[PDB]
Symmetry: C5
Subunit: 311 residues, 5 copies
């Protein structure tokens, strides 16, 4: 089977549509998400034309192997989509109406800069490579683009699923390629991060600052070192569920900055002890009294600066 | 092969029924489960009708390719079901009795609000898309709905497997779609959580309260900080086997609330030391004596409040 | 191809045999194991009978598609077995001798009550569904049931692989089903648990009891709290390689009971300090001297009670 | 297609050869390794013989379906090999030269007794089951057995890949089976274990022995208990990357023996304190001075004994 | 179908060209990476030549089964590539232009010596085995070798994708094999390692050196031992995301060397205490004052030496 011949010199327009049934496994480390959807294609193949008076049927149904079907592929998939043809219907004029249900792992880079208060635009790129005989161009039938009301992506809010109607027509290996951009806009549900990571991490930091109301070096060492170990645990936990970024993230900056506060607290606790041993507790008392105000103030200002830079 | 023609203008009723053989791999983080079951379908095709006295046989067996079979799909599956046709039998009047054995990974959302004292209603949605020639409607043959007595879902109790007999008939991309809801009711076996997470978590908390019976700041710092670290370990262990929810869970609220008790214990231990150093042990003695009663009382009341809000 | 017709009204007996080649991946958490074996089937089909004198051959080899083969399935498998037909041979009377090599992931519940000193009976259930024309019954050819001498299941001892010769004949979806039980008896190699989990866990417990020969509350707090944290690590390690059981296990009971010993040691250490501070060291000395005998005695008796209840 | 008929009563010799292209994924816990190799088979089929003078051609190429090919299988594979036929060539005498490229996950038991200073002999067992018409025997064509110079098994040194030329001919289910043993000799690259596990583990042990140069019970308790916790971490790390063995391993013995040194150090530290409190520091000084020599000496001797028993 | 016959005795040149669409999953531990690309092949088959005047067409499209296609395989792949033929086009002279889209898991070794400041040269080896009729040689059509501008390998910078134009022609099992080397040059994005592993690791080390400004053995023991435990955590974290190398890596050497600094700090802290107890604080003061300068100086010099040896 060869492609449909042109009436004049026009390219073959293949109208497309993606209808998402399910959205799952959005992997941050992998920068991949899974989709189970309907792919609908429509083109005119005048060779399939029939008279329903003779045929006895107003619409003809064909098996995929029986007729010519345009080779529509996905650009950013891991492996070739698992597809199952739902229906192929030809009307008397030769207008084929193809429908398949597919599942694919999609590659969509994520921007972790504002994590976990980030939003993402996922992409599903449809492509068609033109044949020798005639050029194939993609189109969007907006009536056949959508998503199920029950589509739930765990820990994410699905904002919109739209298509960039104008295809990206370009040359590749001396043949015309027509690309289409299906954009799924999502925003992260940041709720859980607050009682599970943020607040537990701030509590262990404030516990370390209780060493500013203690004269016991032994207990202060314990307070600041133990809480530093708990912060290393939170740092590990956070970085394990995230890919290695060549840029600084919001959570990354905060986690890092907090290490400096622990370092300076160790220095303060050390300075205080050296002075007490040197029989200068009045000077040690001045530094400790200052730290009590300085540490929360500098922490609060630094966080205002960071939130301002990122958001 | 085309669909069976209507006698008048009525839609084609496809009677259905799922019989679960196996239920396994209920992944909480993924909100998926694996099922191995029998799918039974039945419809009338008058073109397949025959006289039993003339044909000598009462039943005719066909290969799937030989006759028309309705395209029944599952809405909430990761990938298309692995199916194997068991039998296709035609009665004299033309009633086809189809049976297949399938295995599928089902996507069904879970409500972790009352975890690990939660119950779930898992869903298996059957769907059929109408053809251009005639509309297809789904039905439930209750005689062919069920589950094996040996069906065991590890760490869960299977209550019931029923079907919502009235299908959800709706339009989708200008064609009628008939949906059916098969509901598997399960309830979590909470036993193991008590000696593995709950009681160890409460013991470490009560160990921290022994600092209210000690005047040694160094030892108190150790008691409260060490037990806090052990609580962080349990918090991590619990949150790793659960998805990030946009709502507060029961275990989530308790775990969080316990961090406040540790924070206040550090404050108390600090307050007591500041007073002893300031040569005010009588006032420190009053606060420590109060804490001894206050901490268990407030803990007990807070838990009553939480259990009331969540149950 | 239809099933063999009966001479009278007798059911068709399909003689079966499983010969295990490999046994691997026994997953405790999943309650599954993988098997690679030979499945041998034998039935009489008189339509396939021949005269060896005229034919010149004492046997006839057929391709699976050429003749009727009974649809034998496994009940407790994740997905349908990966099978490859080794040979199909017909004798002059029409006795077909089928042989295939398969691999399957078998779902089989485990009893962790006596873990890690437990024994298990793994199951492989063979099933056949009767056709409308005639009923099919399963049989066991004991000469064709066995296992390779080199079959090794990592961390387990394979005791026996036998078959329950009498099939479970029952109705399912208005058709007779004949089930067969192949039982693989295995017993866990408990050796490794002793130097890796048991003895380390007892050593850390005995280290906590050295606080009964110390008057230093600070050091005692450290001894009992640190060893408690190491016990939490051993509890987590053990529970991670085991499924959540609705019953108490032997290792589970011991691990749990040990938390009580840590709790009481903290209480003792606290009591001793309160008395020393209250200028009552003679009373503290009495309690500490008692604990030195009480703790090992109660530990030894509790363990005797537990071992008795579980074995 | 039937097997080649015998000239007399001799069995059919199928000459074999495995040429390793890639060796990867040697899983210690699973006792499996993945291979990607060439399988070459050669046998004489007189029915395929021809004249090269009249046929003009020296060799005839056939598709696998066109001629009879012996069913060669692997004994110790997880699932049946992924094979792709490279070439089938027939010489004028009728000698068939088959070549396929395969990939398989091989099950081969490992001996962890001398780990991580262990060597292994991996096995690839080739097998052929005789047909009713004639018996099939395997052979090794040493000219067609080898490995690529670039074959790299991560963290292992590949010593040799040879074949045990004499097949294991035996009866199985009343038919002759001919087995061949392909042995891949490898030895573990132990380098990394020294700076990552061994030396860190010895350093933490020597840190615990600095308590023999301290009179501070509080500090000694900290030294011995903290280092014990770090040893538990290393024990967990090591045992997680190894299967549960019914025998004692070299690393297993050392790790275990080290727990005894920690236990005895706690006892010494406790004994020293009890004496100092009892106003007997001279006796405590004698024991502490003895321990300083005893602990390294007994450690050094115990290790000599262990290395002797294991090597 | 047989290969194209030679005009003289020349080998058949198959021009090749890989165009990368996607690069993902670079696993360091596994030394693998996944690729999704276009494979283009071109060869002259005179049997397929035609006159464009008589035929009425300038290009003839064929199905893969219709004509002879050279068996091109990848050397370093886990399993055989997942391929889908895009187009096969024949010009009047008989020049075939083949195009397929494939996906493969490629096994390419990595050099961790300079990790995480390392660069790698990934390899894709194309191979062809000569047939008995004629020899096949590979070539590179540089016009058809490239990569998409959007090709992103997470945590890596893609420098270039080129091909070694001269094939590696060699004998294998008495047949000519022609190998081609496609080299993908990448360099690691080291940014994230600095705030996540390097700086936290240096901070904990500097915290341990505050024991040189303290006379409290108890607090010093705590400072040096706790920070040592945090270093063990960072060593474990680093080594888990890396394979076991038979050579020393840059990060490996630093991590190891740091253990020596902790060991010597314990020795210093111990020496200081022994002297203070022996009523020699003046000598202890000299050693502690020396350590304050020695430790940072030796650390800085050792690091200069290491960076020099590795870069
Ligand atoms: C009377 C003392 C009340 C202390 C209340 C502390 C409130 C902390 C609120 C945190 C909110 C998030 C700077 C952080 C250290 C906490 C204060 C330590 C208590 C000092 C006691 C001094 C005794 C006179
Ligand atoms: C430790 C540091 C605590 C982090 C504080 C949140 C940072 C922030 O302010 O986050 C901001 C985001 C919302 O951002 P958005 O509206 O989606 O972005 C678009 C914004 N433009 C268009 C103006 C650029 O969340 C919130 O509403 C904050 C709620 C969480 C509070 C947690 C308190 C603990
Ligand atoms: C004679 C004192 C007995 C103490 C028994 C403690 C019972 C705890 C029951 C927990 C049940 C779950 C408040 C929690 C701290 C525990 C009490 C610490 C003991 C104080 C000793 C004072 C010495 C006079
Ligand atoms: C510290 C916190 C201790 C945990 C307390 C259990 C929470 C609870 O009270 O859980 C309640 C659930 C049962 O809920 P249900 O019957 O399924 O809900 C449906 C009820 N309606 C429809 C009326 C709303 O479990 C129990 O029977 C409690 C047994 C576990 C005791 C654990 C003690 C430790
Ligand atoms: C003279 C002291 C001998 C110590 C021998 C210890 C035997 C331990 C056997 C373990 C068998 C498993 C009860 C658990 C603590 C162990 C004893 C601590 C030492 C007490 C020091 C007393 C100083 C006079
Ligand atoms: C902590 C306490 C130590 C563990 C108690 C011993 C094991 C057990 O509880 O029992 C012992 C089990 C065997 O039991 P079985 O043969 O499988 O049961 C069948 C019994 N009937 C038929 C009578 C019901 O293994 C052993 O011989 C393990 C010995 C190693 C002891 C661990 C030393 C540390
Ligand atoms: C002058 C004392 C130098 C100490 C040098 C220690 C070398 C350790 C070599 C380990 C090589 C592997 C027994 C192990 C404890 C280490 C010795 C603790 C130092 C004691 C100081 C006493 C002060 C007079
Ligand atoms: C503390 C733990 C100390 C461990 C010492 C290694 C044991 C050993 O001596 O291991 C021995 C193995 C080599 O053994 P093989 O030649 O492969 O065995 C065959 C031997 N027969 C045939 C004679 C029986 O490694 C070595 O060359 C040792 C180098 C590593 C030293 C690490 C020091 C830290
Ligand atoms: C007034 C004291 C200032 C301390 C400044 C410390 C600067 C650290 C810079 C780190 C750069 C990365 C040697 C590492 C230990 C840090 C110094 C401990 C402070 C000693 C206080 C003595 C009191 C007189
Ligand atoms: C602990 C010590 C800190 C680590 C120092 C990094 C080693 C280094 O200096 O690494 C150098 C590499 C670049 O190497 P390259 O140019 O790709 O190699 C080719 C070099 N030839 C061809 C000359 C041999 O990156 C950097 O500029 C490192 C910048 C980050 C510094 C980390 C700060 C903390
Ligand atoms: Cl398509
Ligand atoms: Cl695709
Ligand atoms: Cl169907
Ligand atoms: Cl489906
Ligand atoms: Cl079968
Ligand atoms: Cl099956
Ligand atoms: Cl084969
Ligand atoms: Cl195989
Ligand atoms: Cl190809
Ligand atoms: Cl390939
Ligand atoms: Cl050569
Ligand atoms: Cl050649
Ligand atoms: Na087609
Ligand atoms: Na059909
Ligand atoms: Na059949
Ligand atoms: Na064949
Ligand atoms: Na071909
Ligand atoms: Na301490």
């Amino acid at each position: 089977v060869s492609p449909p011949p042109p009436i004049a010199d026009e390219p073959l327009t293949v109208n497309t549509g993606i209808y998402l049934i399910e959205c799952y496994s959005l992997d941050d480390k992998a920068e991949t998400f899974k989709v189970n959807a309907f792919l609908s294609l429509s083109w005119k193949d005048r060779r399939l034309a029939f008279d329903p008076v003779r045929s006895g049927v107003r619409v003809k149904t064909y098996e995929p192997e029986a007729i010519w079907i345009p080779e529509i592929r996905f650009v950013n998939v891991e492996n070739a989509r698992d597809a199952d043809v739902v229906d192929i219907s030809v009307s008397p004029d030769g207008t084929v109406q193809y429908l398949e249900r597919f599942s694919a792992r999609v590659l969509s880079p994520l921007d972790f800069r504002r994590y976990p208060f980030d939003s993402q635009t996922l992409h599903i790129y449809l492509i068609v490579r033109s044949v020798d005989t005639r050029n194939i161009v993609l189109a969007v039938d907006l009536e056949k683009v959508g998503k199920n009301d029950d589509v739930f992506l765990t820990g994410w809010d699905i904002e919109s699923f739209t298509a960039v109607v104008k295809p990206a027509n370009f040359a590749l290996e001396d043949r015309l390629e027509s690309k289409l951009d299906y954009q799924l806009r999502i925003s992260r549900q940041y709720f859980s991060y607050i009682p599970n990571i943020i607040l537990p991490m701030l509590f262990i930091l404030f516990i370390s600052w209780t060493a500013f109301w203690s004269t016991s070096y032994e207990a202060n060492v314990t307070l600041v070192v133990s809480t530093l170990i708990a912060h290393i645990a939170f740092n590990i936990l956070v970085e394990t569920n995230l890919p290695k970024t060549p840029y600084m993230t919001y959570t990354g900056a905060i986690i890092f900055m907090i290490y400096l506060f622990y370092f300076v607290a160790v220095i303060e606790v050390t300075v205080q002890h050296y002075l007490k041993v040197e029989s200068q507790p009045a000077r040690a008392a001045s530094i400790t009294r200052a730290s009590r105000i300085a540490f929360p103030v500098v922490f609060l200002l630094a966080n205002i600066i960071l939130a301002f830079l990122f958001f």
